[PDB]
Structure 1
Amino acid sequence: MVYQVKDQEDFTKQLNEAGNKLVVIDFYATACGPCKMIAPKLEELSQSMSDVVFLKVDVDECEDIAQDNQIACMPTFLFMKNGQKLDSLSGANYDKLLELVEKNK
């Protein structure tokens, strides 16, 4: 499942739960075409990679976090581990998403 981050303190909450695991955060928007296109594949990825934590952030609801992360288009995938930023992917490029999960898990 892709758990939706409700706020900044729920955000930090989840990066701790994640412990040592790679964390993938989908920064998305409600009516966003590419976001809807990749969403089912991301759900599928979260169910097949149970040692990776998948989160999502509504940039309309969490402008705080989105601007903190200089999100410039949606979806943007942020890759994090132990609180550090490992990489980012701007856009719904499924194969690049797969490569980055493989590279960083």
Structure 2
Amino acid sequence: HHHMVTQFKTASEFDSAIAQDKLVVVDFYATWCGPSKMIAPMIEKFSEQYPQADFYKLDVDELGDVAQKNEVSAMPTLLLFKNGKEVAKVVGANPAAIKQAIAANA
């Protein structure tokens, strides 16, 4: 499918998206951080394997409010939510950790 990873544009968009009754996966990244830019293509592959989960990316330098509120400091950080509730966090570009956190909750 096309359009599987959406880029967040406001804090309010994030707050709404994470409230969904499904797993919502959010890639927190920064363009100056290479390791963090590696999460996008990985998440693109995972989104097709777990289409029942929603996938998003968030540039912390555009949406620093969301980063601070969710206590994200290290780039990349993947945060996983279900029903407004954080169910997992994976810091760093760690494909197996991220995939299994997804598979557990999707």
Q: Normalised by the size of structure 1, how large is the TM-score?
A: 0.90
Q: 3-state DSSP class of the match of 1:34?
A: helix
Question: Is contact 2:40–2:57 with CA below 8 Å preserved after alignment?
Answer: no
- CA deviation after TM superposition for structure 1 residue 37, in Å: 2.3
C-alpha distance in 2 between matches for 1:37 and 1:10? 23
Does 34-43 or 75-84 show the bigger shift? 34-43
The answer for the alignment partner of 1:2 in structure 2 is: 5
- CA deviation after TM superposition for structure 1 residue 71, in Å: 1.0
- CA deviation after TM superposition for structure 1 residue 63, in Å: 0.7
What amino acid sits opposite 1:96 in the alignment?
A
C-alpha distance in 1 between matches for 2:7 and 2:32? 16
Determine what percentage of the aligned residue pairs are the same residue: 44
Size of the alignment, in residue pairs?
103
Structure 1 runs of 4+ aligned residues shifted over 3 Å read none
Aligned-residue CA RMSD (Å):
1.3
Tell me, which stretches of 5 or more residues in structure 2 are unaligned?
Answer: none
C-alpha distance in 2 between matches for 1:38 and 1:22? 17
- CA deviation after TM superposition for structure 1 residue 67, in Å: 0.5
What amino acid sits opposite 1:23 in the alignment?
V
- CA deviation after TM superposition for structure 1 residue 48, in Å: 2.3
Question: Is contact 2:17–2:24 with CA below 8 Å preserved after alignment?
Answer: no
Q: How does 1:1-105 map to 2 (within 5 A)?
A: 1-16=4-19, 19-105=20-106
Q: Normalised by the size of structure 2, how large is the TM-score?
A: 0.89
